[PDB]
């Protein structure tokens, strides 16, 4: 749901969604990592599971739409930025 | 026939399953085509023969060449259960007539009907009119329509005659047992030469 700013979620936040205890959630997440369904790291000092990698999600319409949000945003940041790269020493490209 | 190039259209259908022509209508139609193709070359070596299909997505399988063997090889192999899209077969045959190794020949298509035609009568009437202008003549051999009921072909033929390199005509063979090959008797080997 979250953009490419954070793929980090806390244990607390995972527990709320799951509606399963914080303790058992920590073991469950570890078994999923172990199998290889998901990848990432667990920092239990912070208590976040930082997802490096996430798998192909469920095919519903909404899920097609989630992809659009990032692609559209990316179109505008690239335009802005492309102009800054052209700007620097425009006198010499030759 | 003299200074002429002809492409033969083979009708792959689902009404070629009948043994009214032996062995199978289609196999009898291969044979009918092959003797006509040979007759044309033998009579006048100035003849070229090419092969096009209605079957599948429509493409020119082999082109016009003095060699009857080039066309024959492909004819047997083309899918017996093909499409009876007539109009698309005619159009591609027009494109091949343009591209030959020596260009001085008239443009002709001789067409086989293994079956009653699927696509509207309206469409064929039109195609015939535009095609007539480019000066490609389609001569239609009729056994195929007749199996269920009287020939639609005669109307398309009539529209076609008026401007052609050589005349168009309906050659009729009974759809039952008299064999496909009987077409050698009716003239398609040499048209009417008409205007």
């Amino acid at each position: 749901t979250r953009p490419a700013n954070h793929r980090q979620l806390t244990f607390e936040e995972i527990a709320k969604s799951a509606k399963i205890t914080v303790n058992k959630v920590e073991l469950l997440v570890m078994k999923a990592l172990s199998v290889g369904l998901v990848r990432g790291s667990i920092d239990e000092v912070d208590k976040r599971v930082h997802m490096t990698w996430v798998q192909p999600r469920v095919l519903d319409l909404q899920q097609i739409k989630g992809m659009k949000d990032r692609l559209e945003l990316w179109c505008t940041d690239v335009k802005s930025m492309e102009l800054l790269v052209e700007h620097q020493a425009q006198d010499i490209l030759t | 026939m003299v200074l002429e190039s002809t492409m033969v259209c083979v009708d792959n259908s689902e009404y070629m399953r009948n043994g009214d022509f032996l062995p199978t209508r289609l196999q009898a139609q291969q044979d009918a085509v092959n003797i006509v193709c040979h007759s044309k070359t033998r009579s006048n070596p100035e003849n070229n023969v090419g092969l096009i299909t209605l079957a599948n997505d429509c493409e020119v399988l082999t082109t016009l060449t003095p060699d009857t063997g080039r066309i024959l090889s492909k004819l047997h192999t083309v899918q017996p259960k093909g499409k009876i899209t007539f109009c698309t077969g005619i159009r591609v045959a027009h494109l091949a007539l343009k591209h030959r190794q020596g260009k001085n020949h008239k443009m002709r298509i001789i067409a086989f009907v293994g079956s009653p035609v699927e696509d509207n009568e309206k469409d064929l009437v039109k195609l015939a009119k535009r095609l007539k202008k480019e000066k490609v003549n389609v001569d239609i051999i009729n056994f195929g329509e007749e199996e269920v009921n009287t020939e639609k072909l005669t109307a398309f033929v009539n529209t076609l005659n008026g401007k052609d390199g050589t005349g168009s005509h309906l050659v009729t063979v009974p759809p039952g047992p008299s064999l496909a090959d009987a077409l050698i008797s009716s003239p398609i080997l040499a048209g009417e030469g008409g205007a």
Partner: protein, 289 residues
């Protein structure tokens, strides 16, 4: 009353030149040949659209190898493709000497001259070409008949004029017995230049692609170590440089060529990689996020 029958300056397109360079290069040390197909328009321009090789020779560019049969066979096919073109001339490679025809080759050349007067003979040297316009000349056959007519000056007229160079023995001998030399100039369109350039997708992408941070630090430290060496020579050079010419001063008060230059090149390469990667890194992080 007189006719034309001059050798016009041959316009070689970008694809045809590449096909000649490739034909020769595989083809040598063996003497090889093939035909040139094009269109000739006007009385100044012959454009060489395409070439292909009509079966390659053995020992010599033999008179056996020139074949009207193969030439005829290939020509009728072209008609069916809807590209009918005519034989504009023919090309051959010699590795023997740059811009030279063999003895056998002049006889072979005569069959092409009879077919069309505008038949040309191109000598390709793959051994001695490392610019690929170099050591290629267009030539024309000198028979007993041609020399008596005075066809040889007649060729220079209608273009910029061109004489060969490679080797002394090959230029004197070639000029008398073998040929007269005439010009090749090149026209290649802007589309041809665009395809020539090889636009490539990863080629531009690398510019953005971020290199390791540790690798820049490591490099920064390595680069400094080259400057240190140069720095001893550089301290001595700088003490007196009170006259003119920095290079003389620098050599004189120890330090081969320019110690300053060496130092500067060393920072520039490191600065270049670090500077672009920093520009790229800040940009990507913000864009993707």
């Amino acid at each position: 009353a007189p006719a034309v029958d001059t050798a016009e300056q041959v316009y070689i397109s970008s694809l045809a030149l590449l096909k000649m360079l490739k034909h020769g290069r595989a083809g040598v040390p063996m003497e090889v040949m093939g035909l040139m197909l094009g269109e000739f328009v006007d009385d100044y321009t012959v454009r060489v659209i395409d070439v292909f090789a009509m079966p390659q020779s053995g020992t010599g560019v033999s008179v056996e190898a020139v074949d009207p049969v193969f030439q005829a066979k290939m020509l009728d096919m072209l008609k069916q493709t809807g590209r009918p073109e005519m034989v504009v001339g023919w090309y051959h490679s010699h590795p023997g000497f740059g811009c030279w025809l063999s003895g056998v080759d002049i006889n072979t050349q005569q069959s092409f001259e009879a077919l069309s007067e505008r038949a040309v003979a191109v000598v390709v040297d793959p051994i001695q070409s490392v610019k690929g316009k170099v050591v290629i000349d267009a030539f024309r056959l000198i028979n007993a008949n041609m020399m008596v007519l005075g066809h040889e000056p007649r060729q220079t007229t209608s273009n910029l004029g061109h004489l060969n160079k490679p080797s002394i023995q090959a230029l004197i001998h070639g000029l008398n017995r073998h040929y007269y030399s005439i010009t090749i100039n090149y026209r290649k369109n802007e589309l041809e230049q665009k395809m020539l350039l090889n636009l490539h997708k990863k080629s531009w992408m690398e510019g953005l692609t971020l290199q390791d941070y540790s690798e820049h630090c490591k490099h920064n430290e390595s680069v400094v170590k080259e400057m240190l060496e140069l720095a001893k020579n550089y301290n001595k050079a700088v003490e007196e440089e009170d006259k003119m010419t920095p290079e003389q001063l620098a050599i004189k008060n120890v330090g081969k060529q320019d110690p300053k230059r060496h130092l500067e090149e060393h920072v520039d390469v490191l600065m270049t990689s670090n500077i672009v990667q920093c520009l790229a890194a800040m940009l990507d992080t913000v864009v993707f996020k």
